[PDB]
């Protein structure tokens, strides 16, 4: 309910993160110094042994203990405004369970990283004669999936076109739920994120030539239908046309890797602006997206430290 | 198809729609190669280099006919910085294959 | 190998290993890879090729944005494996045919 109560805890946790000199000095070592440097910080509270599954289980467990708490601890408008940040995990778990039900491989097949829902709902939500019953037992009240899966459930029971329209319905529903209340720093963020999402969808669907307007959504502002079509077909002056927007140094980029690098950098830049609002929802946004940037950069530095990769392979991926 | 290369590498193989395993332990991987010859995974097997230098051992012990598991001495991602002597591997191919130790 | 390994490491470094494992466990095994006759020197050796359907990719708008690139990378990796496979089985057959002919020449001379 109260934004300041959650914001105090989030500012305490933002007081404890990893600096730049950490990975700048962890850019050249041999994975034992990595275990050494992670023995001290707050990610070492769950580090059991040594090796790659230990480090991955430690990062996932500390992120679930340190990030998955803030969807709780408030009740009402505050949780309705803070739950729409860390909700990609629930979509990934739900589509994994959807393809597992549509495949036939057993229910203990997937690993099911934690999102925002307790896993007893997942254990109960595999056996249902009607997939509407699965969406009903999945339904916590104001949830976006609880009103999106039953929205695009109105064709069949279990298909893959259902999953594609589930993804599109999820994106437009999260954007509409951002528009449906008053947070002046989260509506613009989710609009810019879903603009990034369908832009990189158009980049990773180049060359095919299939109907783009069935894939293009609404909720972004920097792109429209004609830029989406002329970006799916191969001329990239339209990608050079985007100036004035925060897509600033991103011009003339063709391959998927440099594209997604630039999009992740501009998302973390525009999401670090959230200290502009030290009372509302901007600060917990600037905590959570900085935390996931730090987590995935820690993971990539772990991979380099273990496998002895050159630092020239990683130097471009700590640029922001 | 099937590999026994590494416990980390086989995830991208399953991501390609292709069976893959991992042991990273030589005698245990030879046992896995025995049971994988016995449950023949579509007649093509790639075995890691610094796990078994020669993949031929299990097939030359058991199945001396028809060469059904096509055995490939595949590499790993630890030595993807240098490749570990592609042309030296070809020299040992020539010497193992015709008996004659020649170079060019 | 170097390019697909770089793509896989950056893929499950930025994206989660759990979700790319789930995407791996969602893809079918793509059955139907097989081997047919090459009747060289009156001796059948099996040449191998796969099926690999390309149009029916599971969610080409994939909510992981790196499993498609890793999928194309390991597809090219498996193509490189099958090409090296049906090259080297032919090479090993020709080599054992050379040593068989050589021991027959030397045996026929030194015996009869």
State how far the Cα of A96 lies from the Cα of C22, in Å rounded to an integer: 6
If residue C25 lies in a helix (H) or strand (E), which one and from where to where?
helix C17-26
CB B40 within 8 A of CB B66: no
Which 8-state DSSP code applies to residue A125?
A: T
If residue C38 lies in a helix (H) or strand (E), which one and from where to where?
strand C34-40
- Neighbouring chains to B with at least 3 Cβ pairs closer than 8 Å: A, C
Please tell me the distance in Å from C56's CA to the nearest CA on chain A.
Answer: 11
What's the burial of B57, exposed, middle or buried (CB within 10 Å: 0-12/13-18/19+)? middle
Q: Could you tell me if A252 lies within 8 Å of chain B, comparing CB atoms?
A: no
Number of structural domains in chain B: 1
| In chain A, where the domains are located | 1-75+280-320, 76-181, 182-279
Please tell me the distance in Å from B40's CA to the nearest CA on chain A.
Answer: 21
CB–CB contact A308 B77 (8 Å): no
Q: Could you tell me if C66 lies within 8 Å of chain A, comparing CB atoms?
A: yes
Q: Could you tell me if C20 lies within 8 Å of chain A, comparing CB atoms?
A: no
């597992």: which residue's tokens? A100
């404890």: which residue's tokens? A16
State how far the Cα of A164 lies from the Cα of A208, in Å rounded to an integer: 17
Rounded (5°) CA angle C33-C36-C41: 150
Q: Angle, nearest 10°, between helix axes A282-307 and A256-271? A: 140
Sign of the torsion angle spanned by Cα atoms A300, A90, A208, A258:
negative
Rounded (5°) CA angle C93-C95-C96: 70
Which 8-state DSSP code applies to residue A160?
A: S
The Cα diameter of chain B in Å comes to 42
Rounded (5°) CA angle A132-A152-A154: 60
Which 8-state DSSP code applies to residue B8?
A: T
Q: Which among B56, B55, B51, B48 is positioned nearest to B9, based on CA atoms?
A: B48
- Neighbouring chains to A with at least 3 Cβ pairs closer than 8 Å: B, C
CB B3 within 8 A of CB B27: no
CB B41 within 8 A of CB B1: yes
Residues of C within 8 A of B9 (CB-CB) are 8
Q: Which among A112, A156, A259, A152 is positioned nearest to A199, based on CA atoms?
A: A259
């609009």: which residue's tokens? A191
List the single residue in A with minimal CA-CA distance to B81: A309
For residue A288, count other CB atoms closer than 10 A to its CB. Answer: 21
State how far the Cα of A54 lies from the Cα of C40, in Å rounded to an integer: 52
Tell me the CATH architecture of domain A182-279: Up-down Bundle (1.20)
Which 8-state DSSP code applies to residue B21?
A: B
């989660």: which residue's tokens? C16
State how far the Cα of C68 lies from the Cα of A35, in Å rounded to an integer: 32
Residues of C within 8 A of A292 (CB-CB) are none
Residue B15, domain extent: 1-104
Please tell me the distance in Å from B38's CA to the nearest CA on chain C.
Answer: 17
Within 13 Å, how many C-alpha atoms sit on residue C3's CB side? 11
Within 13 Å, how many C-alpha atoms sit on residue A172's CB side? 13
CB B93 within 8 A of CB B69: no
CB C19 within 8 A of CB A88: no
For residue A118, count other CB atoms closer than 10 A to its CB. Answer: 10
State how far the Cα of B17 lies from the Cα of A313, in Å rounded to an integer: 27
State how far the Cα of A31 lies from the Cα of A192, in Å rounded to an integer: 37
| Tokens describing residue A160 | 């893959």
Buried (b) or exposed (e) across A85-114, using 16+ Cβ within 10 A? bbbebbbbbbbbbbbbbeeeeeeebbebbb
Residues in chain A, overall count? 320
List the single residue in B with minimal CA-CA distance to A52: B8
Residues of A within 8 A of C69 (CB-CB) are 204, 256-257
Please tell me the distance in Å from B31's CA to the nearest CA on chain C.
Answer: 23
Phi, psi dihedrals of residue A227, rounded to the nearest 5°? -70, -35
For residue C84, count other CB atoms closer than 10 A to its CB. Answer: 14
Select A1-75+280-320's CATH number: 3.30.70.20, 1.10.3720.10, 1.10.132.50, 3.40.1280.10.
1.10.132.50
State how far the Cα of B10 lies from the Cα of A240, in Å rounded to an integer: 39
Tell me if domain A1-75+280-320 and domain A76-181 are identical in fold. no
**Which of A256, A258, A309 is the best residue to mutate to test the C interface, defined by the most C CB atoms within 10 Å of its own CB?**
A256
Resolution in A: 3.2
Q: Could you tell me if A53 lies within 8 Å of chain B, comparing CB atoms?
A: no
CB–CB contact C63 A95 (8 Å): yes
Q: Which among B80, B85, B82, B21 is positioned nearest to B53, based on CA atoms?
A: B85
Among candidates A52, A307, A310 on the partner chain, residue whose Cβ is nearest the Cβ of B77? A307
Homologous superfamily, domain A76-181: V-type ATP synthase subunit C domain (1.20.1690.10)
**Which of B10, B81, B82 is the best residue to mutate to test the A interface, defined by the most A CB atoms within 10 Å of its own CB?**
B81
Q: Could you tell me if A109 lies within 8 Å of chain C, comparing CB atoms?
A: yes
Q: Which among C109, C54, C74 is positioned nearest to B74, based on CA atoms?
A: C74
Tell me the technique behind this structure: cryo-EM
Q: Which among A198, A275, B1, B64 is positioned nearest to C33, based on CA atoms?
A: B1
Q: Could you tell me if B67 lies within 8 Å of chain C, comparing CB atoms?
A: yes
State how far the Cα of A2 lies from the Cα of A281, in Å rounded to an integer: 11
- The terminus-to-terminus CA distance of chain C in angstroms comes to 52
Segments in A223-307 forming alpha helices (H): 225-232, 237-241, 256-271, 282-307
């Amino acid at each position: 309910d109260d934004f300041a109560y959650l914001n105090a805890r989030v500012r305490v946790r933002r007081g404890t993160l990893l600096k730049e000199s950490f990975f700048q000095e962890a850019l050249d070592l041999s994975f034992a110094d990595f275990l050494r440097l992670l023995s001290e910080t707050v990610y070492g509270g769950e580090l059991a042994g040594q090796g790659l599954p230990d480090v991955d289980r430690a990062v996932l467990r500390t992120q679930a203990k340190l990030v998955g708490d803030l969807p709780r601890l408030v009740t009402g408008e505050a949780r309705e405004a803070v739950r729409l940040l860390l909700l990609r995990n629930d979509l990934h778990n739900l589509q994994a369970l959807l393809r597992a039900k549509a495949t036939g491989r057993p229910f203990e097949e997937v690993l099911l990283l934690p999102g925002t829902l307790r896993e007893e709902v997942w254990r109960q939500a595999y056996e249902a004669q009607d997939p509407a019953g699965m969406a009903q037992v999945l339904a916590v009240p104001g949830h976006p999936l609880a009103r999106a899966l039953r929205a695009v459930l109105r064709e069949t029971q279990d298909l893959a076109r259902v999953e594609a329209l589930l993804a599109k319905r999820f994106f437009e529903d999260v954007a509409k739920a951002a528009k449906g209340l008053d947070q002046p720093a989260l509506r613009d963020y989710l609009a810019l994120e879903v603009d990034a999402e369908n832009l990189r969808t158009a980049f990773k669907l180049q060359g095919s030539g299939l109907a783009p307007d069935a894939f293009f959504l609404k909720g972004g502002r920097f792109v429209d239908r004609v830029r989406f079509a002329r970006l799916m077909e191969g001329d990239y002056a339209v990608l050079d046309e985007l100036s004035g927007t925060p897509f600033s140094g991103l011009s003339g980029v063709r391959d998927l890797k440099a594209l997604e690098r630039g999009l992740r950098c501009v998302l973390l830049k525009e999401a670090k602006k959230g200290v502009q609002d030290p009372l509302g929802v901007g600060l917990v946004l600037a905590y959570v997206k900085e935390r996931e940037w730090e987590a995935v950069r820690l993971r990539l530095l772990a991979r380099r430290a273990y496998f002895g990769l050159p630092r020239a392979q990683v130097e471009e991926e700590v640029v922001c | 198809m099937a590999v026994i290369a590494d416990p980390e590498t086989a995830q991208g193989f399953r991501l390609a729609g292709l069976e893959g395993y991992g042991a990273s332990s030589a005698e245990e991987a030879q046992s896995l190669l025995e049971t994988l010859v016995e449950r023949g995974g579509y007649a093509l097997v790639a075995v890691d280099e610094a796990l078994l230098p020669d993949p031929e051992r299990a097939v030359e012990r058991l199945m001396r006919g028809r060469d059904l598991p096509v055995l490939l001495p595949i590499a790993g991602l630890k030595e993807a910085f240098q490749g570990h002597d592609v042309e030296g591997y070809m020299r040992e191919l020539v010497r193992k294959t015709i008996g004659f130790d020649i170079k060019l | 190998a170097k390019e697909a390994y770089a793509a896989l490491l950056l893929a499950q470094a930025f994206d989660g290993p759990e979700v790319v494992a789930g995407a791996a466990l969602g893809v079918p095994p793509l059955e139907g890879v097989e081997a047919e006759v090459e009747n060289v020197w009156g001796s059948k050796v099996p040449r191998l090729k796969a099926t690999f359907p390309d149009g029916a990719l599971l969610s080409p708008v994939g909510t992981p944005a790196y499993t498609l690139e890793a999928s194309r990378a390991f597809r090219r990796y498996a193509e490189a494996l099958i090409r090296v496979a049906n090259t080297e089985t032919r090479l090993k057959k020709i080599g054992e045919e050379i040593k068989k002919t050589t021991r027959r020449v030397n045996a026929l001379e030194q015996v009869v």
